[PDB]
Design a protein around this nucleic acid. Structure first.
Lengths: 57, 51, 87, 161
RNA sequence: AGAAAGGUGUUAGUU
């Protein structure tokens, strides 16, 4: 799961709107897979967010 | 097929390669860290520090 | 190291140790008797790393020249050729 | 060049303090002694006075010896103590090597280095340096390395052998 | 190259 989150982070990888698109795109890509104040909110969102038997039968 | 087909087939140089890979793992990790660059370098450094 | 000396003919003309060559690394040969006193006079740790390889390489070549056998299952050259054949 | 100097001084029947230190000339020696005394027994430079400043030669200048030198380093943290051994023929000769070595490896200045003590180790067993022990082998015999040797444009290529 | 910490890269030392 942690590797998948890292893979999702790797896949994911005005300024307020541009960061908002970055905030949306980074989370939406994780959702699809599943300035300082603005950057603090962006870090807060990331911080808060952060078969075999059948095949062998 | 069915059930553990791979295990059944095996029962019915892998060790040497695994030993060579394990021995070379110590040098590979140091080389990878030295040759790492960009954001992946930070991720590799963070993973090594955590470990 | 201050002195990291080690051990047909052993003629060491132009660093060629023709019995073979040793031009690649500055280590002496000196052809001391039957052996080749492969001396290092205050060199570098790279020379210490090379001599351990050179000593085995020279011995393997000498062993291969005397009796190389087959070892199916030229020392480094045979092993590389066998690996190339396997690949 | 460096020179050994024995400095004896005392505050104006106060106890006399004598010590051996290495300075280019007398004036550096007396100031260095006062700075050393200032940080040891807290004696003011203005109050104190020098009673004797003598130069010291090497009693056996043509005999190879091994000198062990204890010094105090000042670094980025400004606190370090080391011990190093040098093989040469003079106490002042080893000190120059000590100063040259540390200014080389550790990027030091003459002011940040203070000599704690210098001794002459005459026992081969007491030597703790591998290079010193190797140089003291009875079979010391090595070819001279780093030889490399106006009249530019020489006629024939150098032999260099 | 040069004018927080990682490296089975190196050289001198401490416990």
């Amino acid at each position: 799961v942690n590797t998948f989150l890292d893979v999702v982070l790797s896949r994911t990888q005005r300024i307020r709107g541009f960061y908002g698109r970055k905030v949306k795109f980074t989370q939406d890509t994780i959702t699809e897979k599943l300035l300082y104040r603005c950057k603090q909110l962006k870090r807060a969102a990331l911080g808060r967010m952060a078969r075999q038997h059948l095949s062998r039968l | 097929p069915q059930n553990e087909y791979i295990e059944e087939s095996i029962r019915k140089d892998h060790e040497e390669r695994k030993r060579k890979k394990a021995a070379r793992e110590a040098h590979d990790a140091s080389l990878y860290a030295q040759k790492t660059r960009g954001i992946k370098a930070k991720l590799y450094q963070e993973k090594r520090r955590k470990e | 190291d201050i002195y990291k000396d080690e051990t047909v003919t052993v003629d060491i003309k132009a660093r060629n140790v023709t019995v073979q060559n040793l031009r690649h690394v500055d280590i002496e040969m000196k052809k001391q008797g039957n052996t080749i006193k492969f001396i290092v006079w205050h060199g570098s740790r790279k020379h210490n790393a090379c001599i351990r390889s050179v000593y085995s390489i020279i011995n393997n070549m000498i062993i291969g020249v005397t009796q190389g056998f087959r070892y199916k299952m030229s020392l480094e050259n045979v092993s590389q050729s066998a690996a190339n054949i396997k690949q | 060049a460096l020179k050994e100097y024995q400095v004896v001084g005392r505050k104006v029947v106060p106890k006399l303090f004598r010590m051996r230190l290495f300075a280019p000339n007398e004036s550096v020696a007396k100031s260095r002694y006062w700075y050393f005394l200032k940080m040891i027994n807290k004696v003011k430079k203005a109050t104190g006075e020098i009673v004797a400043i003598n130069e010291i030669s090497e009693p056996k200048p043509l005999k190879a010896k091994v000198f062990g030198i204890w010094i105090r380093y000042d670094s980025r943290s400004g606190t370090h103590n080391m011990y190093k051994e040098f093989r040469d023929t003079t106490r002042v000769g080893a000190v120059e090597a000590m100063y040259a070595d540390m200014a080389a490896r550790h990027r030091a200045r003459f002011r940040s280095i203070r000599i704690l003590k210098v001794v002459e180790v005459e026992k081969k067993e007491d030597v703790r340096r591998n290079y010193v022990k190797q140089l003291l082998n009875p079979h010391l015999k090595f070819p001279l390395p780093h030889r490399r040797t106006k009249k530019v444009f020489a006629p024939h290529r150098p032999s260099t052998f």
